[PDB]
Amino acid sequence: IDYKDIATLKNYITESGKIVPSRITGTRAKYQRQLARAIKRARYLSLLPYTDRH
Amino acid sequence: RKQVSDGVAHIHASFNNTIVTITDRQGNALGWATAGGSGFRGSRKSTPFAAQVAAERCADAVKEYGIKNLEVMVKGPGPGRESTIRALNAAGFRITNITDVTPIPHXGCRPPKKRRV
Amino acid sequence: PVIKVRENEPFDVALRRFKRSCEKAGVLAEVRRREFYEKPTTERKRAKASAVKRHAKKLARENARRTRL
Amino acid sequence: SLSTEATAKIVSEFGRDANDTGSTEVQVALLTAQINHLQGHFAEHKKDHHSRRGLLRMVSQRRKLLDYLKRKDVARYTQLIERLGLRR
RNA sequence: AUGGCUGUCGUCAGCUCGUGUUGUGAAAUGUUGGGUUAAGUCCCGCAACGAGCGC
RNA sequence: GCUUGAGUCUCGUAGAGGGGGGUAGAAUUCCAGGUGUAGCGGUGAAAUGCGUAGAGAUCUGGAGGAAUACCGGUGGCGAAGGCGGCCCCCUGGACGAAGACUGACGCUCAGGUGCGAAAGCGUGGGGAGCAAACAGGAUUAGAUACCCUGGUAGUCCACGCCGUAAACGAUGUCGACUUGGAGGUUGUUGGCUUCCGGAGCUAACGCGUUAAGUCGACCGCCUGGGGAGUACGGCCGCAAGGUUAAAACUCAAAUGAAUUGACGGGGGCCCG
Ligand SMILES: CN[C@H]1C[C@@H](N)[C@H](O)[C@@H](O[C@@H]2O[C@H](CO)[C@H](O)[C@@H]3O[C@]4(O[C@H]23)O[C@H]([C@@H](N)CO)[C@H](O)[C@H](O)[C@H]4O)[C@@H]1O
Ligand SMILES: CN[C@H]1C[C@@H](N)[C@H](O)[C@@H](O[C@@H]2O[C@H](CO)[C@H](O)[C@@H]3O[C@]4(O[C@H]23)O[C@H]([C@@H](N)CO)[C@H](O)[C@H](O)[C@H]4O)[C@@H]1O
Ligand SMILES: [K+]
Ligand SMILES: [K+]
Ligand SMILES: [K+]
Ligand SMILES: [K+]
Ligand SMILES: [K+]
Ligand SMILES: [K+]
Ligand SMILES: [K+]
Ligand SMILES: [K+]
Ligand SMILES: [Mg+2]
Ligand SMILES: [Mg+2]
Ligand SMILES: [Mg+2]
Ligand SMILES: [Mg+2]
Ligand SMILES: [Mg+2]
Ligand SMILES: [Mg+2]
Ligand SMILES: [Mg+2]
Ligand SMILES: [Mg+2]
Ligand SMILES: [Mg+2]
Ligand SMILES: [Mg+2]
Ligand SMILES: [Mg+2]
Ligand SMILES: [Mg+2]
Ligand SMILES: [Mg+2]
Ligand SMILES: [Mg+2]
Ligand SMILES: [Mg+2]
Ligand SMILES: [Mg+2]
Ligand SMILES: [Mg+2]
Ligand SMILES: [Mg+2]
């Protein structure tokens, strides 16, 4: 998925910043796990927010 | 005295009680009111209507200042969530902003045990 | 939930929009679940209960189509 | 686990060929190499019980292959335990 | 010990049986179900089909 | 001897598998203030408690511990116990593909050995939150409880000990065989997994190719309810206790599943 690919990863987070379920987006299980890792790495590097507050 | 044109209504809406504090944008309190100290105790205190009055009284606390427009910060699961905001809108404030700032641990600390009744 | 009220936006719209965004983020659900400690045994028990009923909804719902009353 | 090159050295030395990966010599030699390598790991990581179960399987497998080779070919057995420096 | 007579649940909508079928069996089904009625009232569906006492 | 069981090698795959070291964000608490003023907190209702010595609320900064929202799934991994933020280091197993290789090297396993939730124990640390004990407030005929306000062991870490749980699928391990249907997950037709169901089996409930069916190998265990998993002895343990394990005596039952009622401070739907 690439943690650096911010435009992609923003398709898979809500307005609050929370990771969107696979049930909602129709993502395959294998890619949901890879997506989850990418977002969490991006959140660490401060390329994405954890929360809409901060 | 110092006419603040823009402030923030902080609504602490717990299950038991509602606290409205108006601040400036930097978060220094101007005036507050609560459901508990507005002639409502117990069953009455934890209503939308008791939070309704607390909103009204907090407006008429901060009238020394001329707050044109209130940003609003809502915190907690109580029945003074919405009734406070409507009441402030019908005290002649321009609500520019509504925000939920209810704190959510990202796990955090172990909560108290479940009540058996 | 962090509404920014728009230019010439009416109040009820913004308020109902705050209501919808609050129900969306699942805030009041999360405050309620985090109010008291649920043991892992209890959590797994209710998670299995939700799984069982959901699947068991279908087996009865999808035997309702081809059944006359 | 034992690397491609480390593996391939042992297969060459104890085998009849580099394709003779199957022989009891090669199997026992490869087990001995990993058992000895892991003694470094379990010195540092004493509470790595899950990995240690894997080591004890290697030890057990080596014992079984040596007992087979003893009763099959006692000559080859003696050479093997001498080369690898094993008691039995 | 009883007959007869009477109260009560309550004029509440119940209570049963034959035959068939299901179950090793106690039993079940019918009498449940969808609608409807003051009503086990009626229609419709239905391994039940009929019947009696009630209504 | 042989290659079909079992294993080795080669390439790839998924994974909260394990051990070690870092680190991130959210939140709670505390401390320091800035603003501010009479309440806060709590319950069925209260009260104890906190608060004009300025609480609660709100803003800023700091400290510290513990746990990782969302992702998240009858999803995955592990022998079982169990394992969930992110990053690195060390490390175990599983699965698949297509060959090559060894040549029955196998299965099971009394005794033995190892691992083994939570609580508990020892020594040294740590201590936010939670909380046995304890204290106070209520409730009550009483209330050594449930409820409330607090709160110490403990929960966390290192090392050692303990060795037990409804440690459960209440279902030993290995292998073979025997109609189907709908899914999940993971490879290139295989592996793992969820639900339903056929024959068959079952006292019934149910189980049903992941068998509780049809067979074979080996182990463990049972022999009425109590007495009793107790006593005594042995072994183990720092202790708590664990483990092995009787007898007298006593009763004609105890028990499983299912059936019809009745009943529920169970649910639904109705009437007077
Ligand atoms: C996977 N890496 C782990 C490696 C261990 N050596 C750590 O002790 C562990 O860390 C601990 O995790 C637990 C959760 O299982 C708590 O979270 C502890 O609190 C922590 O981590 C502590 O303490 C740390 C400090 N001790 C500094 O390292 C940091 O403050 C962390 O942010 C904080 O979560 C790490 O996670
Ligand atoms: C005879 N050697 C094999 C023995 C098997 N028991 C291993 O599982 C296998 O290991 C695997 O190898 C493949 C290639 O054929 C990949 O490399 C896998 O990725 C690995 O090995 C995995 O996964 C490991 C993890 N399973 C943890 O040990 C570690 O991450 C290793 O660094 C990593 O190479 C070895 O190769
Ligand atoms: K039966
Ligand atoms: K009959
Ligand atoms: K951590
Ligand atoms: K591996
Ligand atoms: K043996
Ligand atoms: K404490
Ligand atoms: K056995
Ligand atoms: K007896
Ligand atoms: Mg409470
Ligand atoms: Mg018959
Ligand atoms: Mg009847
Ligand atoms: Mg009639
Ligand atoms: Mg009928
Ligand atoms: Mg690993
Ligand atoms: Mg413990
Ligand atoms: Mg201790
Ligand atoms: Mg407490
Ligand atoms: Mg308490
Ligand atoms: Mg450690
Ligand atoms: Mg036991
Ligand atoms: Mg368990
Ligand atoms: Mg279980
Ligand atoms: Mg058992
Ligand atoms: Mg079945
Ligand atoms: Mg004993
Ligand atoms: Mg003893």
Residue numbers in the entry:
A (entry chain R): 21 to 74
B (entry chain K): 13 to 129
C (entry chain U): 2 to 70
D (entry chain O): 2 to 89
Publication passage describing the model:
Here we present cryo-electron-microscopy structures of 17 distinct compounds from six different antibiotic classes bound to the bacterial ribosome at resolutions ranging from 1.6 to 2.2 Å. The improved resolution enables a precise description of antibiotic–ribosome interactions, encompassing solvent networks that mediate multiple additional interactions between the drugs and their target.
For hygromycin B, the conformation observed in our structure does not permit coordination of a Mg2+ ion as modeled in the eukaryotic 80S-hygromycin B structure. This latter point is exemplified by tetracycline, where we observe six-atom coordination of the primary magnesium ion (Mg1) with octahedral geometry, which was less defined in previous structures, but also by the binding of hygromycin B to the SSU, where eight atoms are involved in the coordination a putative potassium ion, which was not reported previously. The antibiotic streptomycin was included in two distinct complexes, which were collected at different cryo-EM facilities, and reconstructed and modeled independently. The resulting cryo-EM maps of streptomycin bound to the SSU body were obtained at 1.8 Å and 2.0 Å, respectively.
